[PDB]
Design a protein around this ligand. Structure first.
Ligand SMILES: [Mg+2]
Ligand SMILES: [Mg+2]
Ligand SMILES: [Mg+2]
Lengths: 244, 4, 230, 195, 212, 240, 231, 204, 235, 222
């Protein structure tokens, strides 16, 4: 019968590893680097676009940074199509919670549920896992500013600063070096860009090959604002820090 | 229909 | 839940010394309208069984198709289909009785009263009744509808108990049945003059008589009856 | 079931619920507690169809307790009331709806404010300074309209409540066998034993 | 029916009548309205005979499965809740039951739970259930003390059923007594109302309404 | 639906998918459980290749199943969340029907039964997780500590460890734990638990987590400084 | 070789190896004999034990008052197939007030076994059955193979060393067929037949299993001291 | 036991010169018993305003449902939903429950941000769109509102004048209905400012 | 790979044969049937000294008149026991009587072959089912994952089964007392066990008509162990 | 609207002795005011020394007996030809009846036989499965006529020892098979006189350790 053609996507190796999860992580390691840095007064999200072409429409484009609700965003590393499936599910989940409790969903609860969906694909169903790693950046009134990551295994962890995708080893060492706890958002913006600039596989870091976003309490009195940076705004912030 |  | 539309009236029957007789008129009534006159309500199954059906005619035609299919199915992979493993009257009845009770239990009955008349392989007479409720019973004489009220009393004067069956000939039995059909024509408002009659004998087999008429009727005394009293 | 009342004062929410359980021409019990603790700072009283009331109350209790364990965190009274409303709103278009009316009294620790919610079996939610279900309101509401002030103490609230119970005991046709009174404040939930 | 059960110093008394009726026809005078769920647990039967008999013997099977799985006798609370959750699933279908789950355990002590077919479940000290419940309550309430002796309490439960059997047309036959202790339940005999009435009348001096 | 029998027998009578799930447990961070005279302590290793972590929000290694029972684990982190969720649901369901919280044995028996079911159900792989389940039965002061593993077997332990280098810390506990006289106090029980982890861990900084469970739903997690005091005390006594 | 992985695969020479391997499980099974006259039908079965401490595996199963079988091979598969026969016999009685013909019983077993040889996932039945019965056309003996093939015979045997009893019955055909109105003699012939399949072991009291059905005899099984008469 | 008149309440919407107004009472009751005088029946998603009368549980449910749907709309579309589009969404959602409907009388009001055109619309309980140049009415005093609006209304009213007209329409209609009143709210909506005014009315 | 319900060329089901190898790796379990009762004994085999041995539950009650011992992948036995208990109690509910031991065993064995591509694999555990009923008296059954069950006068299963079975062949007779059977299980367990037999690493149980199924205390077994050692030294 | 129930009349009676039991029933089958059959048996031998009758709506009665007879057959198959005791049969019948709790069999069921101590046993059921063991039970159309007579003659109710001031009751004793059949015959002839649905014939099934014996007697046919 059809047994012959089954890859058995949800089994263990002799060493106790999940083949398809490991191979999905290998796929993610070739994807454009994405960095998240958490400051005391906000969060930065920075991501490198995959080898850009000059005829690509840059302003009306979205590859790396997606909005989940008004208080939560994610940076993507991996297959974009896979990520959008998960993103829409996460958006729906957030609205279910708001409908049920009349309160915005706490960040961890959204992350746990999305990670639980990934876990399911590694344990049952015989389907390939989602080739996607997320950096979650969000705010709620319990824990304040929070950074998380999840990977195809469905395992998630919290971070002060973290990278996913390509050159995470080199990127994490650089973040570990210059990061400190009393850091501000504007400093974190500079750290994020400096790290990408040194770890990039390109010749030089430019505005057209980047996506950028911040989550500040920089609105008017006790409320959070999401700023997805425009092309010209990335061009300006790149000059302001002296990279170009 | 027996009752008690 | 149903209501009957086109209907057939009484089916009457009795046992005699060597077999059984069954009869039913050829009418398909539509309420008070005597709509259809060529309706055969006795249906033979093989050469040893006749199923007489009253009530809803659409359901009768459905039962015809089931009995027809039963004969076909019994013949499958059966070298003795026309011998030891032929369909008996008892098999045919139990099948119908099962169906009738199952349909009433689903609150969607076949709106019929049925009498299965025949002779078993060992020569024993078979005569049993079943209706839309799945109720079954057997008796030396059996009748449905008005027949139960008017025919049974007349047929029971001939065969009142089991011991009267050997003493009753086919001539006497048929005479009583034909008389009963006349009485039903006098008194049942949904009956016709035309009817069919079937005899299943253990020696002479199945004799099926069509296009019989009620005759030797008494009407002459009607001329003397004038007014309603004074 | 029958009489459930609620009063929100300065620093606490007070729920009063009748003790009688009547079936036919017999009072089967005169000490029935028509309430469940959903969380340390949230209490729900209930009244309505026999069986449905307790079954619904305990089902809600289980769900809130499950949430508390999962998140190691207590849901706000507003959040709990919305969850309860949605469950009743689902129920009303079911094959057999929960015929249960509830009051939810809670103390929000983040806001440091008492909160009283009234929800009927249709899923009709309102936040109120004082609330009632059934025929109870037809006497108490007008009484509370007159005597209630928003800056009252817990002791003043209890006296205001005594006035309502006295009016019900005077004009109500049925004997409801007094009330169990419970207070919800910053320190949690406690029962007044002598009322 | 008339059934009662009450809590007291010496445990639980359970008393029931034994009459079954189909309209005004007296079907039986010898019905067992106490179901011996297990040696430690008693259930009383009022309302639908089949409903009560079937689901309370079923309850016994569920209690047996509990002690096999958990290596420990089921609590009165948990036993009563299995039954109440069961009937609640059938709510609206037309089950008719007024029961009382009575038992004694270490963790709870003597306990009585009233359970009925519309899903009600109540812990309590005294309950009377059935078409003659009001007659039984009258005698029971006006004569009950927690400090009753095992001997006196047995009589009061017996006398209460007799009161109902006499006045209620749909209660009668005989009285079945039970005493429930930690050690378990003890049967205290079948007492025919035929002889019990005249015996009580003569010895007590009560029932003066009746032509002696 | 995906039906494939993934967990099957081999010629030598082994179920490799269950055995390979144990290898995933062996890779996981160390977890230790020690029960004293009046308490149970759950210790957990946290690997230090991860700096720049946010310990406020990062999932804790020890999870409350109810107010009186806790669950730690070694192995796949994502797999453990599914077991913890099911356990929490069953704990509330038990309270609802029996009108009493679960015993530690019952809760363990449930979790183990879930693990077993995934070893002979079509279209699923076993859980790559072993658990330590500890707590106190309702109205009881006797400490309880149970272990489960992917196969579905479970048992009670005076003290036990699971995860990487667990054979080393089990060796330590086997000669240092007296059955006749368990750790009489909370301090003694925590110290023995920390000592056992110090055989394997590396540094006693932000690598060790300790959670103490006492009778009547009394559970608390120790902070860095509180744990660091045990580490400082043990090292000074060692230099002798 | 490469074509025996499942029942849905034909070999290049048109063989179904999984069905043939199921047939092999019957050859390993303990011997059982079937034979009939015009009035009666008899089953004889050599029972097998694990060791001296164990019981002897029961080989004969009753299906109705007028029908039953003996088994050789996987006993649980026989239990499934016999249970199906019990239901089919029973359906015939309740619905048609009719005793199920032994020939129809065979046709039903054939069709049930066949479906397991043409679909993916399933496996063939690993048991052979000898069905005896008395119906409206007299005594009958059937042989069932899990390939689906059912055969009506005067006599036969299946199991290990069944060729000896099958040769004997082939010689004795003319004699035992005319043993009419004499149960004990027909059994004696069946016991002598199964004795041709014995090696190193002989028929003892808790080893032998006999069953009979006939004109004025319901299907009944004899074990223990009731078969001491025939040793 | 008529679902649309158990709780009571009213909503009215009107157009003016480069503006729109939507207003509602504050009563929530249980038949004769007044229960709440703070029950607002007007909600907004971005710049689009929705008033809902009828069964209060369904009023609350639908608000939560349209908040849900307009939030997902905004995330995917990367822009705020317009009144014309929202009107269609309301109609679709109501008709989805054709043989088990929400017992409501919704009213959409707003200004299209692109064209600047004032827009109002009304629906029956199962989704039938009622578009109007002038005014939409809904609730237990709809007859009274139709009478007041038809006489008082004139086209191209300025925001300050429109406020007086819609306020007087609602107040005098509410005072001839037992199940409406107990306070009132009026929203005046311009292209990029919105004013909310609570009215003083008789409290019986 | 290959199908789960595949036959070997020799006419055996691969998966059933492979599960039998798993049972050989399991701890020893012995059962002996007498006219005074049936005795069931097992080797506990704790993997470590820190493991509290009394939590090892390899002897189990099915009903008051039926007990059960296991060997192999013991986790697989939980659903088998659950089914057995339900079958026993359900029969009592339907028929107001005790269920026959054989009928209970047959019900458990019906689960065995319900695997394929139903559960994904056979059970990796064998069961010794002991009990009493009015018709056939005291009985012992060996239930395999093949779906087959034999009645036994005595039977050993597990790692030391072939050696213990040979010993049971010589020692068993039809007039054994209950006390004689108790000592015999202890004797044979001590012979095949790796570690030295005591009350903590071995467990005894029995089923009698009068008292039903009972698991013995560690204190009661300890005295039988001491009684056994004294009797062997006495000649 | 279709009514799935009917009334086929007739009456049945079960009495238990010391070492025997009888189950009697008239052979008349009716609908409304008509006779369907003068001899249609409704007391059946079900095997294992159990006799059964399900009186009321005959279609439901036949279906129940059919299902119980089948239950006995499968009890043998599943439990090594074990004899189904009367108490076990009773419990089994309860589950058959209660299985249709929400669309009941419209019948009053009575079974008779011997218990496991060899003593006479009669069990009676309501339409939905409530059951009870009794020395005495009449069922069907004329139950109300016959039952109070049995209370008086079998269980000796309202009868006191002459001269004792109504102090001492007449004491209970087991009746012989001869005495029981006298009471059955007199019960049915009385019921035949005063109930229109009762008559034609009487069939009695007697159960002892030797087996099931039958006796038939004529009744008035009007
Ligand atoms: Mg007004
Ligand atoms: Mg007013
Ligand atoms: Mg007459």
């Amino acid at each position: 019968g059809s047994r012959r053609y089954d890859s058995r996507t949800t089994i263990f190796s002799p060493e106790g590893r999940l083949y398809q999860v490991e191979y999905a992580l290998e796929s993610i390691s070739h994807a454009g680097t994405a960095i998240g840095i958490m400051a005391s007064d906000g969060i930065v999200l920075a991501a490198e676009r995959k080898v850009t072409s000059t005829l690509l429409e840059q302003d009306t484009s979205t590859e790396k940074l997606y909005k989940l609700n008004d208080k939560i965003a994610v940076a993507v590393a991996g297959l974009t199509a896979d990520a959008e499936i998960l993103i829409n599910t996460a958006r729906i989940h957030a609205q279910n919670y708001l409908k049920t409790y009349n309160e915005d969903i706490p960040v961890e609860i959204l992350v746990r549920r999305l990670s639980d969906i990934k876990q399911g694909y590694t344990q049952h169903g015989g389907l390939r896992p989602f080739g996607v790693s997320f950096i979650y950046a969000g705010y709620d009134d319990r824990y304040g500013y929070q950074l998380y990551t999840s990977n195809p295994s469905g395992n998630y962890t919290g971070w002060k600063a973290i990278s996913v995708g390509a050159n995470t080893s080199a990127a994490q060492t650089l973040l570990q070096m210059d990061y400190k706890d009393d850091m501000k958002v504007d400093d974190a913006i500079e750290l994020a860009l400096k790290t990408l600039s040194k770890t990039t596989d390109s010749s030089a870091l430019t505005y057209d090959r980047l996506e950028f976003a911040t989550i500040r309490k920089g609105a008017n009195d006790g409320e959070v604002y999401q700023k997805i940076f425009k092309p010209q705004e990335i061009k300006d912030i790149l000059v302001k820090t002296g990279i170009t | 229909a027996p009752l008690x | 839940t149903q209501q009957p539309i086109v209907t057939g009236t009484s089916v009457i029957s009795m046992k005699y010394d060597n077999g059984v007789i069954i009869a039913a008129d050829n009418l398909g009534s539509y309420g008070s309208l005597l709509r259809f006159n060529g309706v055969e309500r006795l249906i033979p199954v093989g050469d040893n069984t006749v199923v007489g059906i009253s009530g809803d005619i659409s359901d009768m035609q459905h039962i015809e198709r089931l009995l027809k299919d039963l004969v076909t199915e019994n013949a499958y992979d059966n070298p003795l289909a026309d011998a030891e493993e032929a369909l008996e009257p008892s098999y045919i009845f139990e099948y119908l009785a099962t169906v009738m009770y199952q349909r009433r239990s689903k609150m969607n009955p076949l709106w019929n009263a049925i009498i299965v008349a025949g002779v078993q392989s060992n020569g024993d007479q078979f005569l049993r009744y079943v209706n839309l409720l799945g109720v079954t019973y057997s008796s030396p004489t059996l009748a449905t509808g008005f027949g139960a009220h008017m025919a049974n009393p007349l047929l029971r004067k001939v065969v009142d108990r089991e011991s009267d069956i050997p003493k009753t000939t086919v001539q006497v039995a048929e005479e009583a049945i034909v008389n009963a059909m006349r009485v039903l024509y006098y008194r049942d408002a949904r009956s016709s003059r035309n009817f069919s009659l079937a005899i299943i004998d253990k020696n002479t087999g199945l004799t099926f008589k069509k296009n019989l008429q009620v005759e030797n009727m008494k009407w002459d005394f009607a001329k003397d009856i004038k007014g309603y009293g004074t | 079931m029958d009489i459930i009342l609620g009063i929100r004062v300065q620093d606490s929410v007070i729920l009063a619920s009748s003790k009688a359980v009547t079936r036919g021409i017999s009072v089967l019990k005169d000490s029935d507690d028509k309430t469940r603790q959903l969380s340390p700072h949230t209490l729900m009283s209930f009244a309505g169809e026999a069986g449905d009331t307790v079954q619904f109350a305990e089902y809600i209790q289980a769900n809130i307790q499950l949430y508390s364990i999962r998140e190691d965190y207590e849901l706000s009274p507003q959040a709990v009331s919305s969850f309860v409303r949605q469950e009743l709103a689902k129920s009303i278009r079911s094959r057999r709806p929960y015929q249960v009316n509830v009051l939810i009294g809670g103390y929000d620790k983040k806001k440091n404010k008492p909160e009283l919610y009234q929800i009927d079996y249709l899923g009709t939610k309102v936040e109120l300074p004082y609330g009632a279900h059934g025929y109870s309101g037809f006497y108490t509401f007008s009484l509370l309209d007159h005597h209630y002030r928003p800056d009252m103490t817990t002791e003043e609230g209890l006296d205001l409540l005594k006035l309502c119970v006295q009016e019900l005991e005077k004009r109500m046709p049925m004997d409801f066998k007094g009330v169990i009174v419970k207070i919800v404040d910053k320190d949690g939930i406690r029962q007044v034993d002598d009322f | 029916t008339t059934t009662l059960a009450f809590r007291f110093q010496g445990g639980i008394i359970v008393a029931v009548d034994s009459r079954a009726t189909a309209g005004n026809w007296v079907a039986s005078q010898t019905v067992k309205k106490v179901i011996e769920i297990n040696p430690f647990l008693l259930g009383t039967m009022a309302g639908g005979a089949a409903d009560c008999q079937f689901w309370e013997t079923w309850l016994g099977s569920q209690c047996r499965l509990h002690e096999l799985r958990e290596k420990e006798r089921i609590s009165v609370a948990a036993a009563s809740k299995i039954l109440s959750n069961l009937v609640y699933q059938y709510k609206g279908a037309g089950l008719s039951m007024g029961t009382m789950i009575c038992g004694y355990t270490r963790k709870e002590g003597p306990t009585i739970y009233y359970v009925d077919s519309d899903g009600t479940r109540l812990k309590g000290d005294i309950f009377c259930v059935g078409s003659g419940q009001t007659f039984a309550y009258g005698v029971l309430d006006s004569n009950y003390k927690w400090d009753l002796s095992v001997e006196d309490a047995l009589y009061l439960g017996k006398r209460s059923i007799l009161a109902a059997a006499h006045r209620d047309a749909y209660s009668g036959g005989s009285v079945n007594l039970y005493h429930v202790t930690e050690d378990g339940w003890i049967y205290h005999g079948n007492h025919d109302v035929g002889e019990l009435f005249w015996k009580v009348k003569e010895e007590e001096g009560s029932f003066n309404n009746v032509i002696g | 639906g995906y039906d494939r029998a993934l967990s099957i027998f081999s010629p030598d009578g082994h179920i490799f998918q269950v055995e390979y799930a144990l290898e995933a447990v062996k890779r996981g961070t160390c977890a230790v459980g020690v029960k004293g005279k009046n308490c149970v302590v759950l210790g957990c290793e946290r690997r230090s290749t991860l700096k720049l972590q946010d310990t406020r929000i990062t999932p804790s290694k020890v999870s409350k199943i109810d107010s009186h029972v806790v669950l730690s684990f070694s192995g796949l982190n994502a797999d453990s969340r599914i077991l913890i969720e099911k356990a929490r649901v069953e704990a509330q369901s038990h309270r609802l029907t029996l009108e009493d919280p679960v015993t530690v044995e019952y809760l363990t028996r449930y979790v183990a039964g879930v693990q077993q079911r995934y070893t002979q159900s079509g279209g699923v792989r076993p859980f790559g997780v072993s658990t330590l389940i500890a707590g106190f039965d309702p109205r009881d002061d006797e400490p309880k500590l149970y272990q489960t593993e992917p196969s579905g077997i479970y048992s009670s332990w005076s003290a036990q460890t699971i995860g990487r280098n667990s054979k080393t810390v089990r060796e330590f506990l086997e000669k240092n734990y007296d059955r006749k006289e368990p750790p009489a106090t909370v301090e003694e029980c925590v110290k023995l638990t920390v000592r056992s982890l110090l055989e394997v861990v590396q540094t006693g900084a932000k690598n060790i987590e300790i959670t103490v469970v006492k009778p009547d739903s009394d559970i608390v997690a120790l902070s860095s400084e509180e744990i660091n005091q045990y580490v400082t005390q043990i090292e000074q006594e060692k230099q002798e | 070789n490469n074509y025996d992985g499942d029942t849905v695969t034909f070999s290049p020479t048109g063989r179904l190896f999984q069905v043939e391997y199921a047939l092999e499980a019957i050859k390993q099974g303990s011997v059982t004999v079937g034979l009939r006259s015009n009035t009666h039908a008899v089953l004889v079965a050599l029972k097998r034990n694990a060791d001296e401490l164990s019981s002897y595996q029961k080989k004969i199963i009753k299906c109705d008052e007028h029908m039953g079988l003996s088994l050789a091979g996987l006993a649980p598969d026989a239990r499934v197939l016999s249970n199906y026969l019990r239901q089919q016999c029973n359906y015939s009685s309740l619905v048609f007030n009719r005793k199920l013909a032994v020939e129809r019983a065979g046709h039903l077993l054939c069709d049930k076994a066949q479906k397991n040889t043409q679909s993916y996932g399933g496996r063939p039945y690993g048991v052979g059955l000898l069905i005896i019965g008395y119906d409206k056309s007299g005594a009958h003996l059937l042989e069932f193979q899990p390939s689906g093939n059912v055969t009506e015979l005067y006599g036969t045997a299946i199991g290990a060393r069944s060729q000896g009893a099958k040769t004997y019955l082939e010689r004795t055909l003319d004699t035992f067929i005319k043993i009419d109105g004499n149960p004990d003699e027909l059994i004696k012939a069946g016991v002598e037949a199964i004795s041709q399949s014995l090696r190193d072991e002989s028929l003892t009291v808790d080893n032998l299993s006999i069953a009979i059905v006939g004109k004025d005899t319901p299907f009944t099984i004899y074990d223990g001291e009731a078969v001491a008469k025939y040793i | 036991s008529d679902p649309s008149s158990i709780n009571g309440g009213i909503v009215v919407a009107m157009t003016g010169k480069d503006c729109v107004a939507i207003a509602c009472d504050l009563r929530l009751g249980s038949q004769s018993l007044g229960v709440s005088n703070k029950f607002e029946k007007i909600f907004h998603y971005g710049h689009v305003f929705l008033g809902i009368t009828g069964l209060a549980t369904d009023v609350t449910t639908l608000n939560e449902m349209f908040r849900y749907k307009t939030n997902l709309y905004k995330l995917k579309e990367e822009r705020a939903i317009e009144p014309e589009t929202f009107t269609q969404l309301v109609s679709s959602s109501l008709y989805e429950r054709r043989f088990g409907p929400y017992f409501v009388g919704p009213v959409v009001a707003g200004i299209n941000s692109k064209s600047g055109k004032p827009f109002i619309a009304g629906f029956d309980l199962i989704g039938c769109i009622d578009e109007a140049k002038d005014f939409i009415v809904s609730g237990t005093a709809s007859d009274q509102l139709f009478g007041m609006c038809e006489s008082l209304y004139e086209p191209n009213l300025e925001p300050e004048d429109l406020f007086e007209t819609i306020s007087q329409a609602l107040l005098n209609a509410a005072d001839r209905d037992a199940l409406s009143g107990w306070g009132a709210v009026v929203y005046i909506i311009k292209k990029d400012e919105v004013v909310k005014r609570y009215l003083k009315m008789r409290q019986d | 790979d290959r199908g789960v319900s595949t036959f070997s060329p020799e006419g055996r089901l691969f998966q059933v044969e492979y599960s039998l190898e798993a049972i050989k790796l399991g701890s020893t379990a012995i059962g002996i049937a007498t006219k005074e009762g049936v005795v069931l004994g097992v080797e506990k085999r704790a993997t470590s000294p820190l493991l509290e041995s009394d939590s090892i539950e390899k002897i189990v009650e099915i009903d008051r008149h039926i007990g059960c011992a296991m060997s192999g992948l013991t986790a697989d036995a939980r659903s088998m026991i659950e089914h057995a208990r339900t079958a026993a109690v359900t029969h009592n509910l339907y028929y107001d009587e005790d269920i026959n031991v054989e009928s209970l065993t047959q019900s458990v064995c019906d689960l065995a072959l319900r695997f394929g591509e139903l559960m994904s694999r056979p059970f990796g555990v064998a069961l010794l089912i002991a009990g009493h009923d009015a018709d056939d008296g005291y009985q012992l059954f060996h239930a395999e994952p093949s779906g087959t069950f034999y009645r036994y006068n005595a039977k050993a299963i597990g790692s030391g089964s072939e050696g213990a079975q040979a010993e049971l062949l010589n020692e068993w007779h039809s007039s054994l007392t209950l006390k004689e059977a108790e000592l015999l299980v202890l004797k044979i367990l001590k012979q095949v066990m790796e570690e030295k037999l005591d009350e903590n690493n071995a467990q005894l149980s029995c089923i009698t008509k009068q008292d039903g199924f009972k698991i013995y205390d560690n204190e009661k077994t300890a005295e039988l162990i001491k009684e056994l050692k004294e009797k062997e030294a006495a000649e | 609207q279709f009514n799935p129930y009917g009334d086929n009349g007739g009456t049945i009676l079960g009495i238990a002795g010391e070492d025997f039991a009888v189950l009697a029933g008239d052979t008349r089958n009716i609908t409304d005011y008509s006779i369907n059959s003068r001899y249609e048996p409704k007391v059946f031998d079900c095997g294992d020394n159990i006799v059964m009758s399900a009186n009321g709506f005959a279609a439901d009665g036949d279906a129940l007996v059919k299902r119980f007879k089948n239950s006995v057959k499968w009890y043998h198959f599943d439990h090594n030809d074990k004899k189904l005791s009367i108490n076990s049969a009773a419990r089994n019948i309860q589950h058959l009846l209660y299985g249709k709790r929400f669309f009941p069999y419209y019948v009053h069921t009575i079974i008779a036989g011997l218990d496991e101590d060899g003593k006479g046993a009669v069990y009676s059921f309501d339409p939905v499965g409530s059951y009870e063991r009794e020395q005495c039970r009449a069922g069907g159309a004329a139950a109300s006529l016959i039952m109070p007579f049995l209370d008086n003659q079998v269980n000796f109710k309202n009868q006191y020892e002459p001269g004792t001031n109504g102090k001492v009751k007449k004491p209970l004793k087991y009746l012989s098979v001869e005495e029981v059949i006298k009471l059955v015959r007199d019960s049915f002839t009385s019921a035949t006189e005063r109930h229109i649905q009762v008559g034609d014939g009487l069939e009695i099934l007697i159960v002892t350790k030797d087996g099931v014996r039958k006796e038939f007697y004529e009744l008035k046919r009007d």
